[PDB]
């Protein structure tokens, strides 16, 4: 794949895509 | 996460580390 | 505020707006 | 869970506040 | 409802979340 | 430009792209 | 309502231009 | 203005309620 | 129609709004 | 990676994440 | 094809990678 | 040359039509 800069609402979107139904934790 | 993907750059793989 | 109806990434986005930097856990 | 409710029904932003850190 | 930096399309997305069907005006 | 089917946040985003700086009023009857 | 139209049916970008400032 | 409050500076959702109809 | 700064995911979304089912090509 | 249900702009955002600055062709 | 599947059904990221440059 | 057209420098929706297939 590729590597990009992911910040804010964009990073959470990527997180939702990769983990989907498994859920995830977002903690800065 | 922040210091990785946003500041630097990560892959979709690394993001799996934050899946529950 | 009004009663929202949110699914998938829209819910994730709203979780981000309400929580912000504090972060959050997404547990479906 | 609230998450299921928002999508199948409706939820308040206040209820989503339960999920923050 | 922590304070965040909301610009461009991100700001109007939050206006939608907050206002909903009541609608809203967006003028710079 | 093609015709569109826009609901909720998706419609408000189209609005932002169409009106840009001019701004807009979101008045859902 | 053109906004109602955009979602229940379909609309055009030009029609959306009515709502601009 | 809205921008001169939430974008350049920062604001809360409660503040955004001022621009609703 | 106005002229805006469109980058990354935002630009692909504008491209999607303008082209629709015709599809498009994003080659940076 | 989990399976996904992606429609409209959600799919083009998925393509943007998965492909990166390498670019991609959206052919519906 | 794959793009249709993603929406009408489901699809994998690896499959979407067929559309990259 | 598209990101040079709309990201570095601004562009209009009309000009994004050049990238539709
Ligand atoms: Zn959506
Ligand atoms: Zn953004």
UniProtKB/Swiss-Prot annotation, chains A, C, E, I, J:
Domain of life: Eukaryota
Effect of residue 10 to D: In HPRI; Providence
Name this polypeptide is given: Insulin B chain
Organism encoding this protein: Homo sapiens
Section of the entire sequence shown: 25 to 52 of 110
Swiss-Prot record, chain F:
Protein name (record): Insulin B chain
Organism: Homo sapiens
Residues of the full protein shown: 25 to 53 of 110
């Amino acid at each position: 794949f590729v590597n990009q800069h992911l910040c804010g609402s964009h990073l959470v979107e990527a997180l939702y895509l990769v983990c989907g139904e498994r859920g995830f934790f977002y903690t800065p | 996460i922040v210091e990785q993907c946003c500041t630097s750059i990560c892959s979709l793989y690394q993001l799996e580390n934050y899946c529950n």
